[PDB]
């Protein structure tokens, strides 16, 4: 079971190893385009935090999930920021969500006072008054219910079937990583021109000891040229100091 459009869940993925092979191995995965990265390079980088959003929308509105899109579901239900990093996966799920007798447990906004900024939180289902007169109590004239239920039946043609959607969002290499890729470590070498790969950083140089004190929330050092020159070893937490050959 996936949540409604208007109650998309946000799951925690951290302190584990993520293998995207099984993710990309599913046959019916069709609308799979990634913005900040390339889909075949997800297995070699470490992400600081990963989030997954699940909701089921109609087929005619799957195109509204792209960043910057305008419409009626991307203004009152779920909006993506213009600087989105990550990507979305969509696939048809007419097999399960639709029912012979009619499944009516999926809802979505129809009216709202104003649009919503990216991800800003809300659920309230109070009545909405069209007229200038204040309306309360129950439904009637110029004050309605802001919810409508999807009708998912096999008789509907293409463009009305339920479409399960999942969205993955993540930052990139600015914090102590927790979600990584499947890779094998090795033994650190001191004072020798090597080709290090420290949690995503590829470079060349010799690694020494450093005395500079890193606060618990810092992992990288920088200089005026704004290039990394001091990194903290994941496994054992002493501070190194990168200098070229």
């Amino acid at each position, epitope marked *: 079971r996936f949540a409604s459009v208007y109650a998309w869940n946000r799951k925690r993925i951290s302190n584990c190893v993520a293998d995207y092979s099984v993710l990309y191995n599913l046959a019916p995965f069709f609308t799979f385009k990634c913005y900040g990265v390339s889909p075949t390079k997800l297995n070699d980088l470490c992400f600081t935090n990963v989030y997954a959003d699940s909701f089921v929308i109609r087929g005619d509105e799957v195109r509204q999930i792209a960043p910057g899109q305008t419409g009626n579901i991307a203004d009152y239900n779920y909006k993506l920021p213009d600087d989105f990093t990550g990507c979305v996966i969509a696939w048809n799920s007419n097999k399960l969500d639709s029912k012979v007798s009619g499944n009516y447990n999926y809802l979505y906004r129809l009216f709202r006072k104003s649009n919503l900024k990216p991800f800003e939180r809300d659920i309230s289902t109070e009545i909405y008054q069209a007229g200038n*007169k204040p309306c309360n109590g129950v439904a009637g*004239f110029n004050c*309605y*219910f802001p919810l409508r239920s999807y009708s998912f039946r096999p008789t509907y043609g293409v463009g009305h079937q339920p479409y399960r959607v999942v969205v993955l969002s993540f930052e990139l290499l600015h914090a102590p990583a927790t979600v990584c890729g499947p890779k094998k470590s090795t033994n650190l070498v001191k004072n020798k021109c090597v080709n290090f790969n420290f949690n995503g950083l590829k470079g060349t140089g010799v690694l020494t000891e450093s005395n500079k004190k890193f606060l618990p929330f810092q992992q990288f050092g920088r200089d005026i040229a704004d290039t990394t020159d001091a990194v903290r070893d994941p496994q054992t937490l002493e501070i190194l100091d990168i200098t070229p050959c």
Partner: antibody
Amino acid sequence: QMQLVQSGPEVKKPGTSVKVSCKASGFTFTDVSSLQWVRQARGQRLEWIGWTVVGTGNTNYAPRFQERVTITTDKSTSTAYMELSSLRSEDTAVYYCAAPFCSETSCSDGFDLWGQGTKVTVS
Amino acid sequence: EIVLTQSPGTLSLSPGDRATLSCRASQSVRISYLAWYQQKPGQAPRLLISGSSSRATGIPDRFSASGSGTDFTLTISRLEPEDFAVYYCQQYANSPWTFGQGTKVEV
């Protein structure tokens, strides 16, 4: 301009059914706008039949019209249909469709716009 | 379940005079869901005032609404000879809507 249009008067026979439409180019059905239907006989008091919501699709019928009338709204074609069955001589009257000028969230408590009405007569 | 009675039944006053009409019901009290209409022979009814507090488009200041209780009232300052018609009171709040019987004014 902002005015509704409707079909012409019609003559039918007993044991038949009709469909009455209020598709008007002078008004935009949008999503908050709603319209009611009224009937005027020869020198009789006006009677309310029903009104429906374009957005949520909810209806509201008279306590005595749950057996021979159906009201539906199509936003794509911007029209409202009534299927009327069992048309006797008491149903021969002029129909009118009314809807306020309600665009987006701004509209008043009165049905300013008014259709000219169609005279349905059955012999 | 609401029945509206409009009074007085008939009128015959000189043009340009001041007149006032009322309508009555038996259900709960509401003032903002009431509308007044005029219907002419061969023409669709037209709206005059809605909610007893606001005017419609193109409605001159002649029609003035009043009344705070269950009663509803309308007042016309001058009877210009084209206003001879029938008035209708309509409510919205309660169970399915129903109009009044109508008040006809004569010359």
